Structures are given as structure tokens and as C-alpha cells.
Amino acid sequence: CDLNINDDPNYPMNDQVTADLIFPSISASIASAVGGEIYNYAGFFAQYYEQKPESNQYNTLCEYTFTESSQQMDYSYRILFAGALEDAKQVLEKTTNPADRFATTILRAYAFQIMVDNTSDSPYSEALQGNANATPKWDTGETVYKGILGEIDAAEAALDGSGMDVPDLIFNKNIAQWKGFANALRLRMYLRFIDANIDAASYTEKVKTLVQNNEFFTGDVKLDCFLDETDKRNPWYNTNAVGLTGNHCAAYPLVSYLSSTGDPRIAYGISKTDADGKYVGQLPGGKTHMQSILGTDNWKNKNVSAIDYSIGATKPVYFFTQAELQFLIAEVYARFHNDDANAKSAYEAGVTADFAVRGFAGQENTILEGACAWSAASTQADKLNLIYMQKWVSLFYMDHMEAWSEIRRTDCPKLSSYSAAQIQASESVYTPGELVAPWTNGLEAGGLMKRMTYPLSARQQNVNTPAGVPGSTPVWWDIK
Amino acid sequence: DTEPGGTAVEKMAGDWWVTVNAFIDGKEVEDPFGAGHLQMSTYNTASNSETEMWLDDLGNFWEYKLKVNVNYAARTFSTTGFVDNVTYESKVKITDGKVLEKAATTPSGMPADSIVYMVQFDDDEDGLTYKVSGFRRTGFPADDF
Amino acid sequence: GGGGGGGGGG
């Protein structure tokens, strides 16, 4: 009866586990969230899809009737912080290689940036400490952005020239692509400082400097990685097409805009209606009302166009679509460089890139000439509204968590002043493309969703967790 | 056997398919406004009294909604004078209103509950008394209009 | 850390 046997034999000896073995986890775990349930709810808040008539599940999301206790992002706060960010911290006390630390640090900065855009506060300076601080203060958003944007800056400066010794399922050890990611993160974050009107002098010239050097990434920044088997699929397809049945159907704003602009991408991700063959979004929060107003046999699944999961089984998780990177560049031209010809290039550049990804290459014209041409945009604010409404289409079925942040910053699509029930009544008062406030709205203050709840597991365990605020409290960089 | 329960005035609440006649010159006039069958609702009050119930045309006739008084045992309901309309600041007067169990017949040919009540509006510039009367909605679409 | 139910159809 030897007793020294308490080393768990279902796991490797700890000294045998090194960075290259840990590092692949971060990418994937971060993508379990941003691409998984986070993306899933964010897709409602930015009004791409709605709850299918004949099923319940996402009722509380579409209808903004959820509370802090509904744990709508508890599974993801656990992944970003107890997998992703610890594994980050483990890699960082295991490798001395700069180019890996840079890759790790960026992915570290990404998690925080996702946590922030969801709860505008996030543990940071005290998190990822063990028993020595089980209850970390929730640093402020502006604090956290400034910190990670200064982690990226500090890690870049320490590069020396060596390559990566690490499995890179994202860029395959291509340093030059990581610096693009990092510079596009900077571009993304700088623009929010500007429109939150914080230090907006520097961040305007910093962005002016960023786009001038055009040292961004090529292609899309993705985890191309999933097979259609089991435990291996796209997080969103796993959750909503295998674990559950089909809960998603298309929203009224996305189907209007796409159908008003003649856009052929309406057939990518969406399906015609099983009944008349037309494209039919559902009004946000409108599942039960439409069922009261029309019949019961008149608002079943077959009367609203469902979302298509066909394309999703192996569809990757996107961290920064190029189409978005062009749609941020065009914005920086039309409003901080006064350079209508570059902005036009980038604006056309985005739409070009998206039409490639959806398998519609060579149809970039259909909107770049009709309705959505840059010439039809007379006002140097109409142009913005063309950039912005197209970044929104750019992100449909690509990076929903972003689209919702980009809706909150730029506040485009504009919120329609008509109510859901008004629009359902006389559809002609609807400027197509505008978000409709949910029909059943559980926000006392009405309006659109602006932030996730804090995570219930932080509520219960971390006494320093900021106290709750309604869905309608804005995020630290959303100031209108 | 478990008694399901009910609001204090349950047997007189419900959705209804009604038609609106008018008494013009002592002779009843079948559907003057050319309204067709309209939907309306009766439901208990927040006070859960067995003495007042709401009466709601759901905006398909004159756009009215007022608390009537209620005699549950008799299955009748009526106002005392003109009462505040809640839909749009008006006044309404309900008279000789009843709810008659399984007395009616549906479009499909099945029994159902007749409702009948006389009504007047303080801004009916004709000064007319109307006769609302329908039956309780089944839910079968064949019994719809 | 918890467990998901699903709703049904109707």
C-alpha cells in the first residue's frame, strides 16, 4: 500500500506541457465564444435574424426580456477567461520567443476587447491571478482598451526577427499577417476612442497614420479549422443546427435593405419562403404579435424566410473580415483625410471582397452601380451612410459580435422612429435598412440593446462585480 | 378532481364575433355602417371583482373600451349613465346587455354563446342606439370571418 | 458550469 500516488494519471506530467502545446487552445477557445453564443445573440441585437415562428428558444433575446440571471453569456465568460486568457498567461510564462509572445498578446488583447464591447467593464489588471486574488476589481472600459492597445504596442516593439515555434491555425506563423491583425485592431479601437470623444485628437491622427501606412492583413483573419463531424464544427452551427433545431429566421431590416438594393447576396444564408418563394424578414421582437395579428396558420415557419445552415457546418470563425477592414479605411478617408477618391476605392474594395467570400465574385456591380453606387451619395454624410450600411451587410454571417459593436458606435443603421406595429400596419413608412426597436421590449427605457448583462458566475463569486444595469445602458464608447 | 379556477367574472369574458345594427326610426337596421362581423373582447378587471368587467371593441367599430357593471348571477352587464371611455376620451352607455349560454349557433353549425348589448356614443352626432350581437369565437378558422 | 434546456414547438 504505497501512498505517494496522487499525481493524476489521466493527464500529462506538468513539466512536459509547453507553449506549442498550449498555444493552439487560445485561438480556438476565443473562437468558441466570439463565433459561438456571443455571435449568436449579437446577431439579434444587430437585427440579422429573429426567432422562428414554430419554435421557442431565443424568445427572451429577440424580445429583450432577459435578465442578468438568464446567463446569456455565462458560458462565454468562462471560456474567454478560464481557458483563453489563462492559457495565454501560461504561454507567456513558458516561451521567451518574441514572435510567439506577440501572437499570444494580440489574441489576449482580442478577448479583452470582446469582453469590453459586451460588458464595458472587464477584469484585467487583477484577473488571471490564482488563489491570490479570486475576486478581482472590474477595471473600466477606457482603462482596458488603453491597456491592451499598450500591450500590443509593447509586444510589437520587442520583435527581433525570429519566427514562430508555435502551431498557428490562424496565420501559419506568418508574422507579417499578425502585425496586420494588430494594426487592424488598433484601427478598430482607435476609431472608438474617437467617436466616444476621448483623447480624440491623438486617435484621429493615429488612425490617419495607420491607414497611410496601410500595413494591414491580407485575406480574412479567421480560424479555418472546422470539420462537419462532431465536437469539430463551427461553434454556431454546432449549437443551433445540431444541439437544437432550426431556431433562426431572417429579420425585417436585413431582408428589406438587401431586397431594396437589388443585392444578390440575399441568397447567401437566407432561403426563400416555403410558401410563396419570396424573401421575408420578421420584425424584431415580432414573433408573437404577428401570430396574433395574422392567423395562427398564417404565421408558421413557412411564411418567413428561414436562415440557411447548409453553409455553416465547416464555415470558419472570423475575427476581422477584410471587407470590414476596407470599410473602416474608407471611413477614415471620407472624414479624417478629405480624400473622396481613396474612400471610394476602399468602399468599393470592401464590397468587392465580400462578394468574393459569398461566392458571388464578378457581381460586385449590381450594387456598386445600382442604388449603392458611390456616385449616388451626394452628401459627405450620405457617403458614410453607404459605408456603414454596407459594413453591416458585410458582417451578416461573418462576425456578428462586431456588427453589433459597429452599430453602436456609428449608430448606423439608423433607428427607425416608427414602431414595429406601425411598420407592420403600413409598410410604406419604413426606410428600408433601419433597425426596428423590438415589438415586445423588456427594456423599460425602450430602444435597442446596448450591452450584455454581467456574468452571473461573477455576480455570485466576485463581490467586486459592478452592479447590474438594464440592457439599455450604453457601453463606455457608445455616447449616442 | 382539481378545479381549474377562474377570474371572478370568468363566464362572461371571452372573444366574440359580433355585428352592429342600429335602431333608426323604431325599426332595426341590419348593419348600417357596412361593418361585417367584427371581433371584440370582454375580460375581468384588475380588481378581480364579480361586479365590473371591461368591454373592448379592439378598435374595430367606434374604438371604445370602458368598464361596464356586471350581474354575474344573471349574466348581464350595463352602465349607469355615460361612463369615461378609456381608448380616446369619449363617453359610452351600455344598456340591456346579456351573455346567453349556448343559445347561439356557429357558422359551422355548432352551439355557442350569444352576446347582445345596446350602446350609444356621446359623439355620435346622429344620437343613435346600436345593437351589438354575436357569438363566442371558437378558434376553428371556418368559424372566422 | 450549468446546462441548457431547450423549449419546444408550437
Added chain:
Amino acid sequence: KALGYAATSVGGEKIAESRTSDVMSSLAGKIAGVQISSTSSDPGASNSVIIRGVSSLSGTNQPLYVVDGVPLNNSTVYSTDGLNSGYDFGNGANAINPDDVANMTILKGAAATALYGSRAANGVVMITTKSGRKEKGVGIEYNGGVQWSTVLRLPEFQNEFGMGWNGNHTELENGSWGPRFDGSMQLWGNVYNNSQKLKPYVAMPDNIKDFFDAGFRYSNSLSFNGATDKSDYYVSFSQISDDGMIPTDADSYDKYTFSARGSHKAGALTFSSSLNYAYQKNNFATTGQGLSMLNSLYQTPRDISIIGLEDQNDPFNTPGYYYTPYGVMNPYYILNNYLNEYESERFYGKFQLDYEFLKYFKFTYRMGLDTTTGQSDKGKPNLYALYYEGTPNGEGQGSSSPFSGETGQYSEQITRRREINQDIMVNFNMPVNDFNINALVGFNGNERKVSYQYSEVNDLTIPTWFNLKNSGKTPIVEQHMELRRLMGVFGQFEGSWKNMLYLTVTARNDWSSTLPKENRSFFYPGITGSFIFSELLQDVITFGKIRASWGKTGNDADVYMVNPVYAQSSNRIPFGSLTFPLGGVNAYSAGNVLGSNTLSPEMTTESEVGLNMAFFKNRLSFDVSYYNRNTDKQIFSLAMDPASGYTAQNMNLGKIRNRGIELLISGTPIRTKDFSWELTWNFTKNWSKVISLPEELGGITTIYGLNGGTSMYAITGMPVGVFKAQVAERDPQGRIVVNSSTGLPVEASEFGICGDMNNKYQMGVSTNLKYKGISLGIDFDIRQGGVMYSRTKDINYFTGNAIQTAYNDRNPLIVPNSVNKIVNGENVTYVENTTPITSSNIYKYWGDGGSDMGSCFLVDKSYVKLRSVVLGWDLPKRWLAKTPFQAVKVSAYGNNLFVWTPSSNTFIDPEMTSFGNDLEGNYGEYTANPSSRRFGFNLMVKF
């Protein structure tokens, strides 16, 4: 009895008279401070035995079973996902043959445990098996019985409305929210070959009661017995085969045992040995929220005939054309085409060497072995490849079909358990004057091991065939093993004075594998006193006894709770997982449970005092015990803020406390040579209280719960098992708030504490008649208090089948105290509500829990039950005489015969769970199969 803590001894005859497959279920309500519940009425399932409440926050609270007197393996085999694939296959002690039990003795205190080690902290169930004779004549006892079961309690259904949603009519609904019953001919279900079934729109109340058959079960027992003045021999074989009331063979339990036990004295030296083999094959009609059999049965309109859905030449019942596509399948199909099998071979037994020497001494060596193999084979068809294209269930349902992506799965797991235990003792027993010293000093060594191999295969090529090669996609493979070891040394001193004052002093010290190297050792003493007065004219007081005992009992951790591990990288996402390797890369993640090498041994301190008296020649008798049980420094994987990098941390909890009163009354109001009438009243009142959980990790920790739903916890100031659910908002005083526009209640800011799990008090009464050779026994089991989650109530509310949902004759209504909240900026103002819940939205008012909202589905745990009824006719010896019988006793019995429950509960027999037979099972019932009403016969033939 020199025992100075509570205890209770039950005769083999009373154990096996009830004729249950199982040694404990018949003692369900019959022993104070011993809470005995069965997990369900599925054949073969686990049984729960908790004594003086839950001391172990997770998750071990059975008592140490001890057969001869060797620790017996009591492990349990049930599903790690009770929500989607729920099944329960056995308890360790289900193997023991009740016809081989001679005496049970349930030690309840945790103060004199040195003999039986640390696991005793939860009580000890000392079993002692039959032995030798001589006796007329040859030694054979034969028991062969036959029993049926019948459904006991179904939910109270409603028969006012039929198929539909929003209140309108519908041909395809999985629920009953439709028009009022006309009797008018209407359509239902899918269209096949341009035809459709058309039937009177009438209710059918029995349509579920009619689904079920009567389970049957046959039993056969045999024993061979004999002895000499120096030896004894018992050889036995039991056999059971059960096919429960769910239709098909899907609810199956087969039990076989074979045991040979013998002793022999030459000396001085005695040597004995028990060896036993136990087989079982189970099949479980799985529960869950998916395409399972029950959840598919409740989701049936009140007008639909369930016994007509069975024939499969009626194309309207084949998976493609079944009347409803809403996450539901034909029940008859689910039972007929799914697989969930468990088989088990067990060997356990003992060797014992007793050698007496030097007048006063006895040396005893005792080795026990208990080793098990068990094999699960679950599988499900490729529903998709077989039925998707073409059928309207089908292509016609698009992304939402029940068949996606049900592409078929098959797994297989082989589990191996082994524990060897060694006892080496030397007793001492001498009488001086009127004193009597007995001491015992011993050594105990214990080693326990479990390991299992798992392989799963998805997306089956040949759709029906369940084999680890019928697949084109990568297989999944898992492998685990655990090893713990414990040595210890113990002394027990028995003092005595002229059969009047008994004093006991135990002390043990263990060294455990599962505690950090630097702190392996923990010591626990115990002191027990027993004072019989009585011994101090009146033949009125037969017996009197006053009891006191103060003792401790330490414990160790579960395995591998000190070192941090790295796991193979996998992330849990809602209803899925994204597990490495991908693609072609493998990877490891830092384990999410922080370890700790600062742990210290768990410690349980108990304070107990009792009184026992008997009067009038044992015709009135009462025993009372009061106990104060603390359990400090229990190692637990306490929850923690994930932002810290970990999801929990292993540390030493605070005190979990059980105080209470254990009281038994029994009297014989009648006695003749030809008729006796006994009564018995036992009463248990326990107070459970988590005293503190380490401050720095917050106050609370979850024990079980849904994500954003009803979840049961363990909070600092409260009992073990405080629920929280979504309660409805209420204004500054009244006053259900509802939505201005729908009418429906409005969730509050936080969940609300909605009860604990614990019965406030439990009690039981029993009567026993005898008239010449006739026996009659009756027992009732009373528990009142507590609360449990019930998806049974949940799905019959969602579906509109439960009686409660015809509330307002389903006419529009205003929630009778409703109030809208008027918020502008930070101005809050409340107004009488004016918006009704419409007809179209009645379905949702109940779907979410009424005005209770979610918390509506915590059901009143309380019930009263007709536990058992046992009629036994011992044939009089003169009858037979020309026959080879030494005795015949025809017997007729019933179990779980009737349940009574408090009004609010018209849904379940509260004795249910889908989460196992220990603490987490207290969370509730997740559409577990209905409980059942068992009754039958049994014949005894002694030869």
C-alpha cells in the same frame, strides 16, 4: 447493549418479507434518521440511503455498507447528463440477496467509528449473512414469486380543449391549446398519399394511462444449508427478471446471484470464507428533453389516441408522417429502435482467520475483495438518412425537423472496479470482579480502483446497425483510471461494570493517499457511555437505558485534488463542444479547477444523547435520540470567479450541521396465544445548515442547475439545498407587475430563494397483526417539507395538458393584481393594469409559469404513501406431514400502493429524480418515467 449511540436492528425476515429485489427499499419509511428513497420505478434503478442528512456537499452520502463484516462496494451507475440522456442502472448494494440477510444493524452516530474507518461518518449498514443449522430436515429453502406493476400517478390532465396553438385549431400540434371540444369532425396529422385522418374532435382522458401495460416480474430463490458442531455451510442462488409497465422490453432488469459461505473450527483456530458472484442486465427507457419516450408522450394533444400510433403499417405513424414534428417522435418507435443496455459481472467475498489463544485473547485476520466489470452499449438510428428526404418531417420541416442532425450514434464502455480491504485485529476480554475489560487493537488497509474504456462512433453508415465500424467519420475515444489507498491503526477500549455501566473509548489514525504528501495523517478519538438504570420491585419497567457519546471521525479528499493538471483542450459551448485536436493539431489547456496542497483532513464532530425504556414485558417501548453533527474542513471544489483564471478552487469548506431528534414508539395493545396487534410510530426531525463556505470566493456555490433557470445551491446561512428561480416582479407592496402590451408578468431583478430540498419532518407508522398462522402488515411513509424541480409539471404546462391551465376557461384575462410600471428616466410610478393577456397569448402565460413564472415548477416535495402491505399465511405444521415439506408460507404483497400529495402537486410521485441517488438528485425530476404500483405473490417451501 453497551452501545451508547442510536442504532436499529432489523431481522432478515422483515427485510425479505416485502419481497423486493433490494435490501433497503423495503425499509423505506421504517427506521428513524435513515432516509431511504428510490430514484424511480424503472426496473434495476439505484436506491438512496442518507442518514442524518447530507454532510458532504459533494457528493458522497450513502452509508458504508458492510457485509461480513467486510466493506461492500456501493458504487452507482447513472447518466452524467440527466437533461438529455437520463438513465440509472444500479446501486452497489442492489447485489446482495435479501434471502441471505440474517440481521441488519444501522449504526447512525459518527462517534465510535474506529472499527469501520472514515467512510463510517455517514453511518454503517452492518449486514450479517445466514449460516448453519442443524434443523429438520435436508436444508433447502425455496422462494419463488410473481409480481405485476401498474402505473401509480400520472399528472392530472385536462380534457376541455384539444390540439392547437394560440387557441386556434391545428392539425400538427404537439400540444393542446386549441378550441373547445365540439365533437365536430376535424382533420389531424400529416397528409399521406393525398389522404388524411379525420376524427371527432373529442377528448380522450385515458390516452396516456392506456399507453402503459402492466410490468411483470418473476423471482426464484434457492438455498442449501447445513452444519455440524464444528462447521457450517450456506449455498444460495437468486434469480429475478423484470419487464416494467412501459411497453416493449425497453424497461428490463435481470438479476442473478450465487453465494457460498462456510466456516470450520478446529482449535483455537477458526477459518471461514464467503464468495459471491452477481450478474445483471439492464435496459432503460431513457428520459430526457430530446427524442426520448416520455417527453415524447406528454407532448401529445388531449384528443390524440396514443395506442393507435403503434401499428407501423399505418403510414401515418412511420417516423416521416407522425402527427407532429415539434422535437418529438412516436413513442413506440423510440422504444423499439433505440438501445440502452448495461451488463455487469461481479465477484466479491471474504476470508477470515480467528485463532483464540491464552485464555483471554483472540487474533482475527480478514481480507476482502470486490471486483467488477460492466459494459454499456447505447445507440440510436440514423434518423436522418432513413426518413429526412421526402417525408414532411422531413424535408418539409426544413432546418427544424426532428431528424436533424440525428445522424446516428453508437458507443460502448467497459468499466472495471476493484477494492481490496485488509483487517488485522487482536481482541482481549477478561473479567475482573464485577468489571469486564475488552480491548481491541487492529490494522486496516484499503485500496480502491476504478477505470473505464469508452469508444463512440457517430453518423452511422448502415442506419440501423450499431457497431463501432458502421461509420465514415472519426471515432471518439476516452480512457480513465483512479487509484486511492488508505492504511490505518485503531484501538477500541470497552469498559464495563456488572452489566450496568458500559463505557467505550475508540481511537483511530489514518494515512490517506488523497491528501497532500506533507499532511497525510489525521487522528480521531471517540467516547461512548451507556447507563442502564432498571437494575436499580416493579415488573412494570422491563428495561431502561440512557445513552451518551461524543466522538469525531475524519475523512480525506477525492482523488487527485492537489496538483494542477493540464487537460486535452476542449471548450464547452451551449449544446455542443469544440474539442481538440483540430485540424491535425493536438493541444492542452490549463485545468479549470485550481488545486491546493494546503488542504487538511476533513473532521466530523458529533454530540449525541439518547434514552430507551420498555414497560409491561416489552408491550410498550420507546427510544429517543438527539444529535448534533458538525462536519468541518470538507474538501470541496468550491466555485470561483472564472476571471481569476480558474472556474473553481479546491479548499476546505466550513461546517455543515445536522441536528435533530430521532424517536421510535412501539406498543403491543393486545396479546393472546392466538392474536397479536403491534403498533409502531417513528419520527425524524432534522435541521440541516451550511454554517459557512470560505468567505473569499463569495458566499455560495452551485450544486445543480440549468443555465439561466431554476438552480439549487449551498448558501452560507441556509440549509443544504436552497433553490432559486425566476420570480415575478411585485411593486412596493402587492402587486404583480405585467407588461403594458402583452399582459404577461415581468421578471424580477434577481431570482428569488424559493425553498430548500429538505423535508421539515419525516415519520412513519406501522401495524402488524397475527392470528394463528396468519400475518398482516401495513406501513405508511410520511414526509412533509421541502421542494423539488419538476419538468413533469413544466412540460404539461408548456403543452397545455395540465388541469391547472384551463384556468379562466381560457378566455382573455387580466392577472388579478396586475400593475404596469411607468418609468421615465428615473421616475417610477405604478398604475392599475388595463391590458389583458389575449387568447392568442394564454399559451405563454402558462408556458413560463403563470404569475409564479419559472418558480412555478418547484413542486411541494411532500407526500404520504402506502409503502407496503404484506399478507402471509404460515401453513400449520400438521397440515403437511405426508409431504416432504418442513414448512410452507404462501405470501401476497403490494408496494408503493398509493400516494397522497398536497393539492398543489397533481403531477408526480415526489419520489423521483433524474440526477442520481445522492445530493444532486435532490435537484428534481427531469421527466422521469412515472412511478409504479407493484403487487404480487410469493411461495416458501422449506425442505
Added chain:
Amino acid sequence: TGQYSEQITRRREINQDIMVNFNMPVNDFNINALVGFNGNERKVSYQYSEVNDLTIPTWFNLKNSGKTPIVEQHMELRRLMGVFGQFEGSWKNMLYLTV
């Protein structure tokens, strides 16, 4: 590139004999007969799982590999029943004839 594998085999035989024996001397003869029934059931099964190209080069464990695993499963079951009889003849402990 490394390999680890694990197989769990399970075997089980049940044999059953049910006999009756007859032993009567007559004069100097001796007649011993035996009539019986045999029952035999033999089953074997295994579950094998193998894993190649080990990630942590030394540790042996089905979760230690970035490549697909291999999985094998097997079972045989045969049963037999027979009836038999053995006759034993004897003459003053000198002749011994058996059939």
C-alpha cells in the same frame, strides 16, 4: 511516431450437466448406467482502441495524439446441447465392458 493501445477482453462459459446413475449388482454381475444432458454456452468479446503519433512523446494515453484514433470491437457466441448415455458392465471383477 509513437503508438499506444488498450484492449479489454471478456470471456464467459456456462456448462450444465443433469445426470442420473444406476448401480445394481445381480449375482456376480454389476451394471452401472448413466443417462444425461449437457448444456454449454461460450462467449468472448473485446473492445480495442489504438492511438498513433503521440503528442507528448512519452505519455501513453488515448487522448495524447493529434490524429484520428482506431477502434475495434468483436464478439462471438456459440451454444451447444447434447444428450448422452454411458453403460458399464461387470462380471466378478474380471470383465469390464463399456458402451
